[PDB]
């Protein structure tokens, strides 16, 4: 659930807009949170996806899809060869996993015009650039 701000119980040093503790919520889904934790222990297997089985009160049940890139079955067999590429190292933290892609919010079009043009950081940078052409 709610990712209650790690506040000292001292009141959060500033403006009243920042004073919420317990109603402050992950910009990352619980699907992704499940994946990132597994991925640090299992750094040798590369995570494609996560799907849900069941949920009661305190916990949500996921099965996480793990691939062996160092097993020559998975080097072997052409469709999944590209996952062995070093570009896919911990997808989970970069949200190239389905869980992470949704939290970063990359949909074509308009409902996401800001942020689809740039991934979520990138869009900001383009906009706030004075593109100074030489021959002004």
């Amino acid at each position: 659930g709610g990712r209650k701000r790690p506040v000292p119980k001292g009141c959060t040093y500033g403006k009243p807009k920042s004073h919420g503790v317990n109603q402050l919520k992950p910009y990352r889904g619980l699907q992704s949170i499940a994946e990132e934790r597994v991925g640090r222990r299992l750094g040798g297997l590369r995570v494609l996806n996560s799907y849900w089985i069941a949920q009661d009160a305190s916990y949500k049940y996921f099965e996480v899809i793990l691939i062996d890139t160092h097993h020559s079955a998975i080097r072997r067999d052409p469709k999944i060869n590209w996952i062995c590429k070093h570009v896919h190292k911990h997808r989970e933290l970069r949200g190239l996993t389905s869980a992470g892609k949704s939290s970063r919010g990359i949909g074509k079009g308009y409902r996401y015009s800001q942020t689809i043009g740039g991934s979520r950081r990138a869009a900001w940078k383009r906009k706030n650039r004075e593109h100074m052409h030489r021959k002004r």
């Binding site: 009243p16 807009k17 004073h19 109603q23």
Partner: protein, 104 residues
């Protein structure tokens, strides 16, 4: 005490004639949501920034200018007139009586 008659002959632009109008007090009518600024107002207040728009205190304003709603009997077309500041508004006035006893 501004006394006001229940019937006033005044100009109505639908009859193009001076005709009798029944006179009523306007008042102020309930704040409604979905009002244009209220829809916005609520989102702006949406919570934890703490009460956006400045709460007007220092009210010295003893009265309010009364508006009388004059509705023509023949065309039902209604006309607004504002009158000058007075505390105590009355219509069909209990209209003050000239020379009146004070008796015995």
């Amino acid at each position: 005490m501004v006394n006001v008659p229940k019937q006033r002959r005044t100009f109505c632009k639908k009859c193009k004639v001076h005709k009798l109008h029944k006179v009523t007090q306007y008042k102020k009518s309930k704040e409604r949501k979905g009002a244009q600024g209220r829809r916005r107002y609520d989102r702006k207040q949406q919570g934890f920034g703490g009460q956006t728009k400045p709460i007007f205190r220092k009210k010295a304003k003893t009265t309010k200018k009364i508006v009388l709603r004059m509705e023509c009997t023949e065309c039902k077309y209604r006309k607004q007139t504002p009158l000058k500041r007075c505390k105590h508004f009355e219509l069909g006035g209990d209209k003050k009586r000239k020379g009146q006893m004070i008796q015995f």
